[PDB]
Symmetry: C2
Subunit: 110 residues, 2 copies
């Protein structure tokens, strides 16, 4: 229950943070880029993103600001900080190897 | 630095549970297999592993038993408890590569 949940959370955070590695972005831009990159297989809800963005801004990983702002509406953009990137450096490098590890294990068993 | 920590925990749990999906195994064997498959970059301590396996046996994901040495096993329910998380893990790498393209 909790273990699988943590895995799904980490994968989502991983993805979201890679989007922000590509550039400052807003919730709808992010949701769209993830839907395209997963071919419709991962369409995130706004509320998921806000809870995630809340935690991540609380852990210093992310920042927010208003980027489009007029009398008819505004849009909040989220940005990966330099400190966030360094916090995540080790976690990203390890992620990049997880797939090798799995394939190797599958090889080295069978 | 909490979010990186959860990510790394999830990665460790994912690899260990994939090892046991490959077959029942024992702690020393597991540690050596992961060291080889990680080209030496993930050398798990036995104490670390035992903590993880205690949490996982208390969840019904994992079972343990003695053979003829202690072995750990993915439970029949464990496989299912993990199925969706595994499928999702399997897709993450294509998603990231696609993001990089665009």
């Amino acid at each position: 229950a909790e273990i699988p949940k943590e895995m799904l959370r980490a994968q989502t955070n991983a993805i979201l943070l890679n989007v922000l590695k590509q550039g400052d972005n807003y919730v709808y831009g992010i949701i769209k880029q993830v839907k395209e990159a997963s071919n419709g297989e991962m369409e995130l809800n706004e509320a998921t993103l806000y809870t995630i963005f809340k935690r991540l801004e609380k852990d210093g990983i992310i920042s927010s600001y208003w980027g489009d702002e007029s009398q008819g509406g505004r849009r909040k953009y989220y940005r990966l900080t330099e400190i966030g990137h360094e916090n995540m450096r080790l976690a990203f490098e390890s992620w990049s190897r997880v797939d090798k590890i799995i394939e190797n294990l599958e090889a080295n068993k069978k």
